[PDB]
Design a protein around this motif. Sequence first.
Motif, PDB file in Angstrom:
ATOM      1  N   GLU A  29      18.702 -60.103  73.508  1.00 52.71           N
ATOM      2  CA  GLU A  29      17.591 -60.650  72.736  1.00 52.71           C
ATOM      3  C   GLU A  29      16.304 -60.766  73.559  1.00 52.71           C
ATOM      4  OE1 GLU A  29      18.247 -65.473  73.514  1.00 52.71           O
ATOM      5  OE2 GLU A  29      18.468 -64.633  71.472  1.00 52.71           O
ATOM      6  N   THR A  30      15.178 -60.807  72.861  1.00 53.89           N
ATOM      7  CA  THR A  30      13.869 -60.943  73.489  1.00 53.89           C
ATOM      8  C   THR A  30      12.966 -61.692  72.520  1.00 53.89           C
ATOM      9  OG1 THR A  30      13.037 -58.895  72.509  1.00 53.89           O
ATOM     10  CG2 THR A  30      14.063 -58.740  74.683  1.00 53.89           C
ATOM     11  N   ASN A  31      11.862 -62.225  73.022  1.00 58.04           N
ATOM     12  CA  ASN A  31      10.929 -62.902  72.142  1.00 58.04           C
ATOM     13  C   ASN A  31       9.895 -61.852  71.721  1.00 58.04           C
ATOM     14  OD1 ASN A  31       9.318 -62.564  74.433  1.00 58.04           O
ATOM     15  ND2 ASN A  31       9.348 -64.731  74.989  1.00 58.04           N
ATOM     16  N   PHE A  32       8.874 -62.291  71.000  1.00 64.96           N
ATOM     17  CA  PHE A  32       7.834 -61.389  70.537  1.00 64.96           C
ATOM     18  C   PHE A  32       7.177 -60.644  71.688  1.00 64.96           C
ATOM     19  CE2 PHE A  32       4.188 -59.947  68.135  1.00 64.96           C
ATOM     20  CZ  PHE A  32       3.107 -60.103  69.000  1.00 64.96           C
ATOM     21  N   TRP A  33       7.114 -61.289  72.850  1.00 66.91           N
ATOM     22  CA  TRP A  33       6.477 -60.705  74.025  1.00 66.91           C
ATOM     23  C   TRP A  33       7.324 -59.706  74.802  1.00 66.91           C
ATOM     24  CZ3 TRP A  33       1.337 -61.938  74.481  1.00 66.91           C
ATOM     25  CH2 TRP A  33       0.905 -62.963  73.611  1.00 66.91           C
ATOM     26  N   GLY A  34       8.580 -59.531  74.390  1.00 74.16           N
ATOM     27  CA  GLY A  34       9.453 -58.569  75.043  1.00 74.16           C
ATOM     28  C   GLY A  34      10.357 -59.072  76.155  1.00 74.16           C
ATOM     29  N   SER A  35      10.455 -60.385  76.317  1.00 67.94           N
ATOM     30  CA  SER A  35      11.282 -60.924  77.384  1.00 67.94           C
ATOM     31  C   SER A  35      12.110 -62.126  76.977  1.00 67.94           C
ATOM     32  CB  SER A  35      10.400 -61.311  78.580  1.00 67.94           C
ATOM     33  OG  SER A  35       9.395 -62.241  78.197  1.00 67.94           O
ATOM     34  N   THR A  36      12.993 -62.528  77.877  1.00 69.27           N
ATOM     35  CA  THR A  36      13.819 -63.694  77.658  1.00 69.27           C
ATOM     36  C   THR A  36      14.256 -64.160  79.045  1.00 69.27           C
ATOM     37  OG1 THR A  36      15.613 -64.589  76.278  1.00 69.27           O
ATOM     38  CG2 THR A  36      16.110 -62.592  77.525  1.00 69.27           C
ATOM     39  N   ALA A  37      14.521 -65.455  79.176  1.00 74.54           N
ATOM     40  CA  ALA A  37      14.953 -66.031  80.442  1.00 74.54           C
ATOM     41  C   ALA A  37      16.467 -66.211  80.420  1.00 74.54           C
ATOM     42  CB  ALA A  37      14.258 -67.376  80.671  1.00 74.54           C
ATOM     43  N   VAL A  67      13.930 -61.289  81.958  1.00 71.91           N
ATOM     44  CA  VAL A  67      14.354 -59.901  81.891  1.00 71.91           C
ATOM     45  C   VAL A  67      13.507 -59.300  80.770  1.00 71.91           C
ATOM     46  CG1 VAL A  67      16.691 -60.182  82.802  1.00 71.91           C
ATOM     47  CG2 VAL A  67      16.269 -60.624  80.382  1.00 71.91           C
ATOM     48  N   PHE A  68      13.090 -58.050  80.932  1.00 75.17           N
ATOM     49  CA  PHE A  68      12.262 -57.410  79.922  1.00 75.17           C
ATOM     50  C   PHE A  68      13.047 -56.405  79.106  1.00 75.17           C
ATOM     51  CE2 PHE A  68       8.610 -59.623  81.239  1.00 75.17           C
ATOM     52  CZ  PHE A  68       8.868 -59.910  82.581  1.00 75.17           C
ATOM     53  N   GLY A  69      13.085 -56.647  77.796  1.00 77.04           N
ATOM     54  CA  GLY A  69      13.839 -55.805  76.893  1.00 77.04           C
ATOM     55  C   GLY A  69      13.132 -54.642  76.222  1.00 77.04           C
ATOM     56  N   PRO A  70      13.772 -54.066  75.190  1.00 77.73           N
ATOM     57  CA  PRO A  70      13.312 -52.931  74.387  1.00 77.73           C
ATOM     58  C   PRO A  70      11.922 -53.037  73.766  1.00 77.73           C
ATOM     59  CG  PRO A  70      15.618 -53.275  74.047  1.00 77.73           C
ATOM     60  CD  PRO A  70      15.107 -54.502  74.735  1.00 77.73           C
ATOM     61  N   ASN A  71      11.456 -54.251  73.494  1.00 84.29           N
ATOM     62  CA  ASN A  71      10.142 -54.402  72.886  1.00 84.29           C
ATOM     63  C   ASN A  71       9.099 -54.922  73.869  1.00 84.29           C
ATOM     64  OD1 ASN A  71      11.429 -56.946  72.897  1.00 84.29           O
ATOM     65  ND2 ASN A  71       9.981 -57.684  71.354  1.00 84.29           N
ATOM     66  N   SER A  72       9.400 -54.788  75.160  1.00 76.39           N
ATOM     67  CA  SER A  72       8.477 -55.206  76.208  1.00 76.39           C
ATOM     68  C   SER A  72       7.449 -54.085  76.424  1.00 76.39           C
ATOM     69  CB  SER A  72       9.230 -55.473  77.515  1.00 76.39           C
ATOM     70  OG  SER A  72       9.757 -54.274  78.051  1.00 76.39           O
ATOM     71  N   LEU A  73       6.372 -54.396  77.137  1.00 77.55           N
ATOM     72  CA  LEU A  73       5.319 -53.419  77.408  1.00 77.55           C
ATOM     73  C   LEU A  73       5.868 -52.172  78.104  1.00 77.55           C
ATOM     74  CD1 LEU A  73       2.128 -53.320  77.141  1.00 77.55           C
ATOM     75  CD2 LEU A  73       2.062 -54.064  79.504  1.00 77.55           C
ATOM     76  N   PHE A  74       6.761 -52.392  79.064  1.00 75.39           N
ATOM     77  CA  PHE A  74       7.354 -51.327  79.871  1.00 75.39           C
ATOM     78  C   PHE A  74       8.301 -50.344  79.184  1.00 75.39           C
ATOM     79  CE2 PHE A  74       5.410 -53.778  82.992  1.00 75.39           C
ATOM     80  CZ  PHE A  74       5.986 -55.024  83.165  1.00 75.39           C
ATOM     81  N   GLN A  75       8.864 -50.713  78.037  1.00 74.77           N
ATOM     82  CA  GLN A  75       9.826 -49.835  77.371  1.00 74.77           C
ATOM     83  C   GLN A  75       9.330 -48.420  77.058  1.00 74.77           C
ATOM     84  OE1 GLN A  75      13.262 -48.529  76.676  1.00 74.77           O
ATOM     85  NE2 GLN A  75      13.059 -50.717  77.112  1.00 74.77           N
ATOM     86  N   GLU A  76       8.151 -48.306  76.445  1.00 73.33           N
ATOM     87  CA  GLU A  76       7.595 -46.998  76.108  1.00 73.33           C
ATOM     88  C   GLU A  76       7.508 -46.126  77.361  1.00 73.33           C
ATOM     89  OE1 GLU A  76       3.292 -45.991  74.824  1.00 73.33           O
ATOM     90  OE2 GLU A  76       4.342 -46.094  72.903  1.00 73.33           O
TER      91      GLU A  76
END
Length: 262
Positions: free
Chosen positions: A182-190, A159-168
Motif C-alpha cells: 500500500e501507499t498514500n496519495f504521495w506514493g509512499s508508506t512508512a 518505502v516508495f511504491g507504484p504510484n510514487s514519482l520514481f515509478q515511471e
Amino acid sequence: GIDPNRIVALEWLPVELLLALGIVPYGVADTINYRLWVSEPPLPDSVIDVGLRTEPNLELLTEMKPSFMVWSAGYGPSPEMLARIAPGRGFNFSDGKQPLAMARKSLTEMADLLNLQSAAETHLAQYEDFIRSMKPRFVKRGARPLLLTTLIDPRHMLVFGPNSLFQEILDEYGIPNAWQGETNFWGSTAVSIDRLAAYKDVDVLCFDHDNSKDMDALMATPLWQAMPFVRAGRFQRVPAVWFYGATLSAMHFVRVLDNAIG
C-alpha cells in the motif's frame, strides 16, 4: 501571476515548477529544510524565507504583497484563506497513480499562467530527452527488483511504491519496484524495520537527508545487521532527492540512480 519577480512558492513542488521555467522565487516556504530534502536547484540567497509550508508567516506574506502565490493541492494552509492574501494557484502532485504525467501538466499550466509557453516546451523536451538518453546505463542489470527508501526515524522507513514519482522512471528503465504494498496519495508508506527483512534478494537505496545520527542508530541494531539485503551487500545510502516534486526531482533521481546502480 502577473509579476514574475514577485511569485511566492509555499510548497516545494511548485518551487520546482518555477525553477524549471527560469523564474527566481520572490519568497519560498522553509528554505532551511529545502536544502536538506530537495537540495538540488539551490535557491539563490535573495529568496525570502516565508516560514514553514504548514504554518507560513501570514504577516510577512501580507507585507510582501506577492503578485501570485503557488502551493500544493491538499497540503498546507487552507486555499480559501491563502486566496484572501493574494492571487494564487494550487498544484496537484499526482492523480493518485502517475505523478510525472501530472508534473508535465503542472509545468504547462504554470507556464500558461506566466506566458512562458516556449520555456516549458524547451524544458519538457530536455526532460524527455534526458530520461531516454540514460536508458542504456541500466541495460546491464536484469529484473532484480529495486527498493527505494528513506529513514524517517530509527523505527520507521518510508518505502516508495507504484504510484510514487520514481515509478515511471523505473518502468522506463525496466527496473521492477520491490514495493508493491500500500501507499498514500504521495506514493509512499512508512514501515517498521522488520518489514524490510522480507526482501531477501533486492537492491536497496536509502536517500539521506542530513540524518547520520539516525542512520547510525538504525545500522547499529542487530536487526539491521541481520537484514538479508544488507548481508547480501545490496544496501546503499544515496544523496537526497525530493520524492514529491516534478521533472527536476525526476532527473535528479536519474543522476543519483545512475551513480548508485548505473
